[PDB]
Amino acid sequence: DMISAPWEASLTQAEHSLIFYFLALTGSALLFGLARTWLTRGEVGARYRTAVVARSGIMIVATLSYVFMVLAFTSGYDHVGSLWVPNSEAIMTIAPRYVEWSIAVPLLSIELLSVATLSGVSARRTRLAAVAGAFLMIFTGFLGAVVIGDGRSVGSLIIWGAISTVFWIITAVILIRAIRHSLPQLTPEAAALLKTATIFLMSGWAVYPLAYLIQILFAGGLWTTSIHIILCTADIVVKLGFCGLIHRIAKLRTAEDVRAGVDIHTEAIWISSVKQSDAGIPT
Amino acid sequence: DMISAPWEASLTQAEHSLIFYFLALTGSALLFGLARTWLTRGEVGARYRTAVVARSGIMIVATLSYVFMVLAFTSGYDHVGSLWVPNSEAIMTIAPRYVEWSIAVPLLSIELLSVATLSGVSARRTRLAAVAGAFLMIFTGFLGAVVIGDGRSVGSLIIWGAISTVFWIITAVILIRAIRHSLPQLTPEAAALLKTATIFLMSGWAVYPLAYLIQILFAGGLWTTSIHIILCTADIVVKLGFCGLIHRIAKLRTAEDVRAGVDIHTEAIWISSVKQSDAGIPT
Amino acid sequence: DMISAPWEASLTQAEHSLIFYFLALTGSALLFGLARTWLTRGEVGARYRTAVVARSGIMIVATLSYVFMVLAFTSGYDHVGSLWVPNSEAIMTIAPRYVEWSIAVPLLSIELLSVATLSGVSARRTRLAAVAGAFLMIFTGFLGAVVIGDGRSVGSLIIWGAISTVFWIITAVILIRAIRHSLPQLTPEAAALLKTATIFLMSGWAVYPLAYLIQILFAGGLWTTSIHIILCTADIVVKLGFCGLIHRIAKLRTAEDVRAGVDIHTEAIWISSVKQSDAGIPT
Amino acid sequence: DMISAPWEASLTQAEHSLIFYFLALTGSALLFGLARTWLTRGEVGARYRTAVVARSGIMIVATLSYVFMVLAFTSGYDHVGSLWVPNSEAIMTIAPRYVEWSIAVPLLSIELLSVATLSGVSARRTRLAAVAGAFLMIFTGFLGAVVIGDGRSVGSLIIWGAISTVFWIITAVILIRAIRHSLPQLTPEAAALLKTATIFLMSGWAVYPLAYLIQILFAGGLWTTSIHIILCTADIVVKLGFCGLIHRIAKLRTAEDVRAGVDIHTEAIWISSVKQSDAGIPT
Amino acid sequence: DMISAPWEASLTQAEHSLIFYFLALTGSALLFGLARTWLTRGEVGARYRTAVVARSGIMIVATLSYVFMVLAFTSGYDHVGSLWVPNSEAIMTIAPRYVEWSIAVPLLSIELLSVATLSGVSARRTRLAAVAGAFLMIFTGFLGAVVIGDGRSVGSLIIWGAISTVFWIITAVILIRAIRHSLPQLTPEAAALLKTATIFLMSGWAVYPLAYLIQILFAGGLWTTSIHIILCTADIVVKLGFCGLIHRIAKLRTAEDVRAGVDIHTEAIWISSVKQSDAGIPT
Ligand SMILES: *C/C=C(C)/C=C/C=C(C)/C=C/C1=C(C)CCCC1(C)C
Ligand SMILES: *C/C=C(C)/C=C/C=C(C)/C=C/C1=C(C)CCCC1(C)C
Ligand SMILES: *C/C=C(C)/C=C/C=C(C)/C=C/C1=C(C)CCCC1(C)C
Ligand SMILES: *C/C=C(C)/C=C/C=C(C)/C=C/C1=C(C)CCCC1(C)C
Numbered sequence A, B, C, D, E: 001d002m003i004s005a006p007w008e009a010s011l012t013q014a015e016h017s018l019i020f021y022f023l024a025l026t027g028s029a030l031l032f033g034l035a036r037t038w039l040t041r042g043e044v045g046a047r048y049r050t051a052v053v054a055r056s057g058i059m060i061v062a063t064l065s066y067v068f069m070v071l072a073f074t075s076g077y078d079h080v081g082s083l084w085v086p087n088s089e090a091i092m093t094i095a096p097r098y099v100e101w102s103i104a105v106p107l108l109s110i111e112l113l114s115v116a117t118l119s120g121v122s123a124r125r126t127r128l129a130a131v132a133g134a135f136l137m138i139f140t141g142f143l144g145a146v147v148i149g150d151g152r153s154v155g156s157l158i159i160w161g162a163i164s165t166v167f168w169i170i171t172a173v174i175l176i177r178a179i180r181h182s183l184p185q186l187t188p189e190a191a192a193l194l195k196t197a198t199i200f201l202m203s204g205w206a207v208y209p210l211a212y213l214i215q216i217l218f219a220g221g222l223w224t225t226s227i228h229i230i231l232c233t234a235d236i237v238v239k240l241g242f243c244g245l246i247h248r249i250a251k252l253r254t255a256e257d258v259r260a261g262v263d264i265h266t267e268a269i270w271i272s273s274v275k276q277s278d279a280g281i282p283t
């Protein structure tokens, strides 16, 4: 059957206002996250610098995405009467997300495996497979939701959604299997945090498919608002919450290495205002 | 009853000029603050780096808020005759503030608890509760003032204002209780500054609700100008004044740690052209 | 009587070209200055880091000001016939200066007292008084020249000019008294430079009031060009010249501290290709 | 014979969407790459800093290129009916690539020779010859494809394509001869990676000429989409893949130098979560 | 007699394309140069940091200039028929150069004297005289070519050109005399490079007056293209070539100081993959 794309529904002044708030809130929060990433990049050892690199990429891409979207929002809707009517630039308030997710979901997978105990070419097979799975899941989703059918075809939305879901399961299994292998080889305190962070990431990835089911099932300005709120909220929680969790595991692992003599760190490491390791100079 | 939103009043050339000055002054001052934050980030220990992270986020978000607003001012008012008439972009000269405050007030709470003596999961409960309270206070305010009623409904403004005030009291109590617990455990010199900084932040938070009462009670170009001046002024004083106070406490606490052997700092710490601690080398 | 605001005069192609050159030249020079400030920030001790902070703020705000003005120039004049006719945003080619000066003149006062021998709360008193005086001098000027009268009233220009001049004398006395107290307590070489820098700053502050007297006395495209040239030139000389002088005094004072054991500096200090102090390691 | 330039074909909503995705994806990935380059610049010794410099230039130029192109895409196609019709700004969605490649291909050659064993004036002859060849190959291509004939002449496309191909062979021979001389003088582990990286770069350079043959042979919206996808994909693989490979060789060579006493490095070097060298202090 | 300003000639699609390429190529190359300057700023001692400061300013200003010009090109010409017709924004594709040169030529003089053996107030007289001469040469040129006559008067072009040439000779003599005094006091290897760099800078300064003689003698789209190519090419060669040469002399001088005990450098210095000096610790 046919449906109306989320970007093809007229918004009341409330709905217009809420959407601008959330878009701008999310873009702001991600710019904070970018600063935080750069300001705390030296708390982690070079053995774990991939986590900083991934997180930096996530924050940059996502910040651009939201800037674009906020601007395309101001130019995608015009206040005809009491309602705001979508232009052609309305789709540019939703479509940039998939660009962002195409970079971010692969990078989030890398961030997670960064602090796991995989090394050498083993930390290459899993990394490629995850990156592949992650990108393919977003790309298949983009096809169903924006490209094939114009985001107005239920059958396209359902088919490509199912494809995207297969890749989800694949990526998720790969990651979870990798973590499950690492947990035994980490210290208890690290292993515990890494389990939590795996749960958080997977659980946060479950929210995004809900914004997809809405597009299939419900159309309206309420539902366009819902989608924006859900996705914006999810972004703040995942890209601020999860990226803080990985930094703490990287810090904790750095500190463990320092104590073990595996490496030396220029500054002391504090986690929760407790000193984990002291500063040291190359002997 | 029904009233006119601050952004729905025609400005005289004076009022237009004053508003552009203050908007631009505030945006400029916050960009100075951002530079100051980055240039002085290494004066503080890693045990207190959260203060610089919070302050950096505050300065960044607030700076883009004001940039947006300054641009939306130049495009939100058209010089019909001697007066400037508000367009649709007029609300974009006021609404972005709430986006900024939604990030900033939570971050200001974090900045304050950064230099208090809470640690571990204790420095997590309070931090989440404050962040929650702070965000909810701004968000409820945004609803009354921009969303529910279009900022033209007294009853909406009064109801959501009262809600926002409850969350204010909650956040304030949480913070003040946290500080009151820390003061005994700080050194006299730090405790004194931390008391002051708590008073300054709370006192500065009282000014913002006045701009809200104006919107309820008075409409006009004078009153739109008043609101802009009050809020701009408050921003400069709180986001420059308070953020300097927390940096001094962080520096003083760093210096105390250095003297106690709790940690080492690469550079000497000067506060008021008095040396607080010397530079040291890791082990 | 009534006059015509500087931004209300049609420019010949010469005058249009000269103004664009100077605006762009000044904006470029200030961007060079900003780079220079960041690139040389580590030549100075932490006891004098306020000088870098002030100078960084000056350069940033002034650079934005000129960017804004250059853009408002390209869009504020339309080539009707041989002449360029001012639009409504012609005033945006002159008004942003006062925003800049409102930040910069206070910051320049701070930069100067940074390298003087005032310490503790004594530094605070003088710093607040100067900052107050400086801002009030610019703000009163802005009122007379842009706000009260629309920059078309001689009596407003004369009254607010006189007010602004009182605050000038106040700020100048405060600063000069502070310097005169420091000179005895500095080393001869530093004292000499600090005297010079005081003369340079005060002397440079005398040029700006001339652009104000023009606006009162003469109107025309020649006179609008004169104002732009004078103010642009003054900005380059004061914000490049003076800010270099303070850096040399900060470097020289850093070097004196290093030699005295008051502090240690990571790199050697060179002034005029003469080594002032050697690099040292913390303890 | 007369043919239609890639930028002179109307795109279906699918093709429009795909192209925007890929353009934006590539621009995002290159901005990630730029961050990665800056964040990992200190993993390499100063003997190999040219690799970082080249890679930084590549990432910056390419990121600008894609930003320009993404913006020119939004303004180069107007949605007349179901199809998007190319404007005059359509050529600005394709032509900027050649600007980018004119910088990037020479820089990629430099990046490769950076980690080879050529030194002194020998590392000047080869470097100039390669830079010359590389630039001339792109420039001759630009002439055929954009300038001489307007990208609508088969004979121009064929002639300048053949010229560009001669320069390709020249550059490729120069590079390959340089590598083949270095491989024997490198350590096995480095030599192996350097062989691989040479194959990757040369192989990636083969993809770009395919987008050229399309322009000669096929015109259409499908083919304009194909060109964009091919070139975007190639950019991500070459500018992320290859630039990672050279960094690993630079890290490995740094680590070898550290172990040999040829130099000292401030931080330990990890490659694949295996420590290659320890951190050391100057003398 | 009267002539047509370079910006008053209609461009064929070829000429339009070539000009956009070169403008964009030059802007890109200068952005690479800016990155290179920042990435290699720590290879040089603090005794020679002026070279980095000058080079940074050059690259920044020149990059802005070209960005402005590239944008003014896209908006300065309208595709009437097969030809592109210049509007009022066409002059903004040529005039910004003189702003850039007004900063850059003085800065290039400073960069050169940075690595010569002048010190104290001696390194002040020459520096001011050169800066004066350099700026006056560009400014007099701007008058003849853009301001006095509108770039349409041969006699103005000839008179101001002759003035500009006098200042050229003055600056050149000052510089050459300074170098000729330094060469004897440098080490052979440095002296040789410094001679070369002097020749390169002076020789590159000779190219710019040719673009001026064209404007006097020839008008046309070919000739406006020629001017753009010549000036763009000259910029790449001088601003990238010369600024590399000065960095090598600064590195070599740093290394000589390190070996002599005049100073210590934190990193080893490599020039052409040959180690010039080792890394050292302050004490
Ligand atoms: C920071 C951004 C994140 C974590 C985005 C995640 C997005 C997904 C996990 C998307 C998954 C999808 C499906 C499984 C079904 C089809 C629709 C998608 C693309 C939303
Ligand atoms: C830097 C910005 C700051 C400190 C902003 C603070 C804003 C408040 C404390 C707002 C509080 C409000 C109420 C208590 C009542 C409703 C209106 C609000 C949102 C202004
Ligand atoms: C870098 C900018 C500087 C130093 C600006 C300084 C401006 C002044 C000192 C202005 C003073 C004025 C008066 C004393 C009279 C009224 C007019 C003013 C504002 C120009
Ligand atoms: C990162 C960008 C890269 C590596 C671009 C490479 C481009 C080429 C190798 C282009 C070569 C061409 C020919 C050999 C024939 C004519 C067409 C060209 C310019 C595409």
Ligand SMILES: *C/C=C(C)/C=C/C=C(C)/C=C/C1=C(C)CCCC1(C)C
Pocket: E101, E104, E105, E108, E137, E138, E141, E142, E161, E164, E165, E168, E204, E205, E206, E208, E209, E212, E235, E238, E239
């Ligand atoms: C990177 C920019 C540089 C080096 C620019 C240099 C420009 C000149 C040396 C210009 C000189 C001129 C004359 C000597 C006479 C005619 C007018 C000028 C301005 C082109």
